[PDB]
Amino acid sequence: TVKGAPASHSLAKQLYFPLPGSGYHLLAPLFPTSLVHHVHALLREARFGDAAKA
RNA sequence: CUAAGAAAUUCACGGCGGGCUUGAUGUCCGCGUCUACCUGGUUCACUGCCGUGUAGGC
Numbered sequence: 001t002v003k004g005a006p007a008s009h010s011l012a013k014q015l016y017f018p019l020p021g022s023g024y025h026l027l028a029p030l031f032p033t034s035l036v037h038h039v040h041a042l043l044r045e046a047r048f049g050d051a052a053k054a
Numbered sequence: 055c056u057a058a059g060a061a062a063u064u065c066a067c068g069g070c071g072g073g074c075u076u077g078a079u080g081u082c083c084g085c086g087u088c089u090a091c092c093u094g095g096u097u098c099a100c101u102g103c104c105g106u107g108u109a110g111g112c
Contacts, residue, residue, distance in 0.1 A: 013057040029057055 008014055014028035 011059095013059095015058060016055050018055085024055080031057095 008028045012028060012030075014026050016024045017027045018024060
């Protein structure tokens with residue numbers, strides 16, 4: 001549980017978003033660790049075989 | 055101010071081997087097609103006393 005310093009080392013994406021009146025924000029996106037991969041793998045190998053043979 | 059902004063894939067190859075498709079068959083019967091028309095508004099034609107001489111003759 002430690003961070004360091006906020007940065008975005010020159011190759012991470014960061015994209016202007018138009019504010020309503022005027023102005024922008026830089027909005028650096030970060031890759032999430034949402035695991036739909038577990039829900040994808042368990043619905044393709046675990047009991048996809050049993051439902052598929054039925 | 056665009057998940058922004060950048061990017062040489064690069065190369066080669068033996069698909070080969072062989073072969074019985076066979077036989078048989080009933081298309082089979084009919085039939086009312088009628089009726090009336092102007093090719094005519096066109097053949098710039100053989101000559102010749104003729105002038106071949108762009109008008110000139112029956």
